Design a protein around this ligand. Sequence first.
Ligand SMILES: C[C@H]1C[C@@H](O)CN(c2ncc(Cl)c(Nc3ccc4c(c3)c3c(c(=O)n4C)OCC(F)(F)[C@H](C4CC4)N3)n2)C1
Ligand SMILES: C[C@H]1C[C@@H](O)CN(c2ncc(Cl)c(Nc3ccc4c(c3)c3c(c(=O)n4C)OCC(F)(F)[C@H](C4CC4)N3)n2)C1
Ligand SMILES: [Cl-]
Ligand SMILES: [Cl-]
Lengths: 131, 131
Amino acid sequence: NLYFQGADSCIQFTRHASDVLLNLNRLRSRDILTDVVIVVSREQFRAHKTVLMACSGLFYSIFTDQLKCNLSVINLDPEINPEGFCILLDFMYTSRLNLREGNIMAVMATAMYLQMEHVVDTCRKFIKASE
Amino acid sequence: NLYFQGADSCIQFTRHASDVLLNLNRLRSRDILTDVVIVVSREQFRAHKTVLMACSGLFYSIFTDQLKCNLSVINLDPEINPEGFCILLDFMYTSRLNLREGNIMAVMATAMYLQMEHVVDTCRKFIKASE
Ligand SMILES: C[C@H]1C[C@@H](O)CN(c2ncc(Cl)c(Nc3ccc4c(c3)c3c(c(=O)n4C)OCC(F)(F)[C@H](C4CC4)N3)n2)C1
Ligand SMILES: C[C@H]1C[C@@H](O)CN(c2ncc(Cl)c(Nc3ccc4c(c3)c3c(c(=O)n4C)OCC(F)(F)[C@H](C4CC4)N3)n2)C1
Ligand SMILES: [Cl-]
Ligand SMILES: [Cl-]
């Protein structure tokens, strides 16, 4: 082996990062050490600010702001689709994007708003493949 | 590609977990949203509780405790070697363990205390290879 010699001196553990991400998603499911509620229209999503910042240019800008870093509730634009945000929040914590014909437009618009560039590029490529 | 078809329905992003871990280590280096000081003898190490819990059976037990989850300072056993803790803290945030002849005993004892089982097993195998 579960480890290898890295390019540098250190031994590297193959599944470390994905196992850490799995444990962070386990904490999220159990509502452990969650420190923010993201409100999208009617819905509320509990999460860890550090995970949101690590996965979004918008959350990175918000939580690096001296004033907003201390907020426990963040309201997103009411035009953001809650299902699209939920798919992207799941992706942040798992590396898996449940992209489908019925949700791809909402996922793309939400990823543009959240500043998740590679997800936007992937959504554009899948849309382009159908036209 | 930077994505593939996963075993399940979802598309999976190959470098997502290690890129998230890199961003969490960037936040740690800049002291952004760190919420705990770990004290080992004289030294102090700032970190994110969620990362410590995701990487240690001891931190998982401490921060799931209703009383200790709210502590901003955690003092480890004064017999814990600060350098060994520093190597393991770096490993938690990077997946890379800087294991060497001069630090392997301290890294192993610290990983046993912190409940990082695979790191203990790896330390034992490297020690066994020299005898
Ligand atoms: C000096 C500072 C200056 C800062 O613009 C950058 N850096 C940075 N440092 C720390 C953090 Cl927490 C951070 N967050 C951050 C910022 C922008 C991001 C993504 C993440 C982000 C993005 C994305 O498109 N953008 C634009 O894609 C969505 C994603 F989930 F796949 C990724 C995850 C895999 C890592 N995260 N970005 C370095
Ligand atoms: C129902 C709950 C019941 C709980 O014992 C388990 N689970 C669990 N859920 C959430 C978390 Cl945050 C968690 N943390 C946790 C607990 C124990 C651990 C490691 C991590 C841990 C360990 C380790 O040996 N142990 C014993 O190795 C050190 C490491 F950095 F490589 C890993 C990192 C790669 C993931 N983390 N463990 C599930
Ligand atoms: Cl708000
Ligand atoms: Cl203490």
